[PDB]
Amino acid sequence: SKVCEISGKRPIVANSIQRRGKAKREGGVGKKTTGISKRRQYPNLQKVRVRVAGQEITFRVAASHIPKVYELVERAKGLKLEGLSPKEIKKELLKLL
Amino acid sequence: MKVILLEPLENLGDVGQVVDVKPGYARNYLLPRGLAVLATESNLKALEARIRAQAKRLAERKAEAERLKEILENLTLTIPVRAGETKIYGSVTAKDIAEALSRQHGVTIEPKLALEKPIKELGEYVLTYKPHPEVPIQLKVSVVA
RNA sequence: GGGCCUGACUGCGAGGCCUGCAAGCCGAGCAGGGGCGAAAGCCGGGCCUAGUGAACCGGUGGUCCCGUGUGGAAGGGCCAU
RNA sequence: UGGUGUUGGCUCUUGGUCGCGCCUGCGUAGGAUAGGUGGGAGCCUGUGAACCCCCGCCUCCGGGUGGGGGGGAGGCGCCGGUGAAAUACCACCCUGGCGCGGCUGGGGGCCUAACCCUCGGAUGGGGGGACAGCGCUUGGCGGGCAGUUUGACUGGGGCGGU
RNA sequence: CGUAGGGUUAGGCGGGACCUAAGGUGAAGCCGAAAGGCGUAGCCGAAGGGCAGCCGGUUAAUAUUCCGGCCCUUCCCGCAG
RNA sequence: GUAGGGAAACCGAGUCCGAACAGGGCGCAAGCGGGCCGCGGCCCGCAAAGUCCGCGGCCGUGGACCCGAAACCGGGCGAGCUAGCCCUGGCCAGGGUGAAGCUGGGGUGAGACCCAGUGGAGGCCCGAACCGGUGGGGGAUGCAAACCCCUCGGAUGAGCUGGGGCUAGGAGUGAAAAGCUAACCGAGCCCGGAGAUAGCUGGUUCUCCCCGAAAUGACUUUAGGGUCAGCCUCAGGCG
RNA sequence: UGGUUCGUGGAGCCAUGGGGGAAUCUGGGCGGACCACCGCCUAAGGCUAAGUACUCCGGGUGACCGAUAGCGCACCAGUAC
RNA sequence: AGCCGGUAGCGGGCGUGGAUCCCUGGAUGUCCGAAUGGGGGAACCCGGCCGGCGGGAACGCCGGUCACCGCGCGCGCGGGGGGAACCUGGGGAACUGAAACAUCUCAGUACCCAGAGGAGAGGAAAGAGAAAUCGACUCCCUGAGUAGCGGCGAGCGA
């Protein structure tokens, strides 16, 4: 999944470490790493679809920022919208950040 | 989370009330359909602005009232009609009392006033004004020749 | 074969065997505290030569040695296993 | 594949719990069935007495208790008796349960409005529907693929043996 | 083969100012750490469709191209119907 | 460098183990003078701990004496060869066999079906172009890094072919041979990581002088390699 | 998960893909788990010369080479092929 | 005081009324190339609009102008590509070392990508860490192969 349109959050590379053994803290002999490998962790992207100035504009956003969409909209009331193109509304919106 | 309801809403609350819901409800039902609004600092205020303003507008309403409580219940009113013993040669609808109180010590309010029909006999009367809810003014009135 | 007993000691260890290293083996004697003996004395497992496993990493007991500004604590060290 | 995010509404039936409402608690003794520890010398009646009948629930079978009905100025405790504990009554908490509701965990159905699909049309309709899809995490299956291992001696190597 | 000089003439032949094929590219739009991958429309893409020239003469070397004869195509202005 | 011992607290010419003021481990002692002076007071020189630089021998880390892999990984370049598919065109002399259908006739209640005529089907037959490549001979520093003569297979089909296109490296394509993917494919080429690594093979360049081994033992994923020991050599010391 | 010397370790600190989710100085983070003291610092906005690196380019100098050397190229070379 | 490149020669010119040559500025600057009107097999092909040329309507030539994207209020301003190394960021191997190998190592190296610029990054403490201390960042020496890290192996290393 791409990048969150609000937070700029974007996939990161991170290791999948596989271990074996009983931990030291559990009186065991220690942990042995039986494999490391590269993976990615994704932002939890989703779709927010809001009506703004009587127009359907949709964000692709991470869950950790869904309400940020809704804060924008509310802020956006005092903005000179209409009868913009959906694209330029969205543009104008993000500018509020 | 928290929302300010714009309308009355079944098992949530009266308009203007602030209730706490699951965000899914809010975002996919309440907010779209102008039923409620998010409880943000920015319209948590508009709650109280509406409140304060409501309180003060009622305050003056119980002010220019308290004028019309001391200035009224503190005079009289004759009526210059004629009278052949009992029952009136003209007749006073509250519209008269309207313009009538608006005549002598004159004075002016806006009827309503308790004259379900107009005054057909003569004598000693005291008519129920009520300019504003929970503020009674009894008012002395005489019908004379 | 029997009597009592726990030396199948704890500190050590002059000097040697053997030996590339690392190990392996023998050990008299001084001290602590004992056993058996009247005593001289003998006893630091087994008539002897096989019955074993270096480090690392962990477990338990003790020790109270370090303890991340300080008091602790976490965790380690040392002794035992 | 479980959990959680995206993910929401409404009922139904069960679980956990917490707010009260209530009734439940059975050795000997002791009037009787004493759940525990405080307040207790008085309580109850026009917030109309013992008795009388019907029922509900309890039963350790003698009782308990809710109400209903007629009666309507009449009945219980400190003392006493008793036992480990003593008494009405005012509490508070149990024990156990029934009902209310908060908050939720299982389910069952239904809804639509997220998501998804579809429709000469669409700030819309029809279908799927909080599933599926996707994010993080859990455990599993996993030569589909990847990195490697697969000892030495040895009258050659292997086999056997060591 | 070396040095030199000459030689390739088109409205009609072939291709372009026409069309579309696979594919390619690609307003819209989707997607992807970046690079970039997709994508109805359009556009690109021919040895496919479309489209008006035949016979002879001439040069050391060109000719459906130059010349000769006969015959056409399109665009422009005009006139008339 | 001037202090060590101890795991450490610490202590310190000592310290650790220990109850020890036994025993033991690891440490601690400084030069050579000659003289002045009323035995070293302590000068003075000479030498030295140590250390700094130069030099040389060797060792560590780097490609580390030089040359050489089979391979691995990254990024690119290739389907003008070849394999498959897509688009659009083209090609296949001649001959032979004679399916279904039809038409006529025979047949039956009507049919089946039979007979002729017609008809012109087919991964049909013969055989050129074309596509193959069976067997043999030749060719073998070739005409040719796959050829030539003779002979042979398909030849209306799952045929052959021009043009335009697409699919590629753990990937393509494959009527399947691990075949083909630009004359060597059990993983293309090129460039880079890169001087990969090579306990293996080869090679190691002037002169004289002195000495002069080993091919054993222990252990070793060791066994044609190593560590230590044995044996060689040089310097200092002992005698 | 990554960064750090830190390979799960007693694992803080810094960064953050997921879930939960505050406060505005009597607030917050840190001093290597945690706690208590004592201290340090003020996160979630940004800009900031110089000292530093390199060498296509110019110049200066070599116990640098001297046409098999030195750049691959002293020459019409990234050419011929 | 010579000169018309490396070049002589044919055949012609210029220069102390200061030429050639060098420096600076300016003019010209075909076609391709980020390539940008559109198309395209780079240096070819084809157009719209405005102005000029020709007898000039058809034809052709000349001059201007016309891509896309990001910002601002149709108009402006920016971007695009390139650059030996050097820099930051987003990704990121393996040979090899461990005398085998998987954790480890080689290494955040090679390389790919994006961006920056004459540098770049960093940069005014939610720092350091034990001093009643220090006081941005970078960079050098030292600290120090110390502290530690580590199949406590190889090795890594503040």
Swiss-Prot record, chain A:
**Keyword Metal-binding on this protein?**
no
The UniProt GO MF terms for this protein read:
structural constituent of ribosome
Q: Which is one Gene Ontology cellular component term of this protein?
A: ribonucleoprotein complex
Locate the transmembrane regions by residue number: none
Biological process (GO) annotations held by this record are: translation
Q: Which Pfam families match?
A: Ribosomal_L28 (PF00830)
Query: Which Gene3D superfamilies does this one have?
Result: 2.20.150.30, 3.30.160.850
Give the superkingdom in one word.
Bacteria
**UniProt keyword annotations, A-Z:** Ribonucleoprotein, Ribosomal protein
Report the InterPro entries cross-referenced here: Bacterial_rp_bL28 (IPR050096), Ribosomal_bL28 (IPR026569), Ribosomal_bL28/bL31-like_sf (IPR034704), Ribosomal_bL28_bact-type (IPR001383)
What is the protein's quaternary organization? Part of the 50S ribosomal subunit.
Q: State the family named in the UniProt similarity comment for this chain.
A: Belongs to the bacterial ribosomal protein bL28 family.
Q: What is this protein called?
A: Large ribosomal subunit protein bL28
From Swiss-Prot, chain B:
As for what it does, the entry says: Binds to the 23S rRNA. Extends more that 50 Angstroms beyond the surface of the 70S ribosome.
Assigned protein family: Belongs to the bacterial ribosomal protein bL9 family.
Quick one: a GO cellular component term? ribonucleoprotein complex
A biological process (GO) annotation for this entry? translation
Q: Write the record's keywords in alphabetical order, separated by commas.
A: Ribonucleoprotein, Ribosomal protein, RNA-binding, rRNA-binding
Q: How does it assemble?
A: Part of the 50S ribosomal subunit.
Keyword match Phosphoprotein = no
What is the taxonomic lineage of the source species? Bacteria, Thermotogati, Deinococcota, Deinococci, Thermales
Q: Which residues form a coiled coil?
A: none
Output this protein's name: Large ribosomal subunit protein bL9
Molecular function terms from GO? rRNA binding; structural constituent of ribosome
Q: Which domain of life does the UniProt lineage start with?
A: Bacteria
Could you tell me which InterPro entries the record lists for this protein?
A: Ribosomal_bL9, Ribosomal_bL9/RNase_H1_N, Ribosomal_bL9_bac/chp, Ribosomal_bL9_C, Ribosomal_bL9_C_sf, Ribosomal_bL9_N, Ribosomal_bL9_N_sf
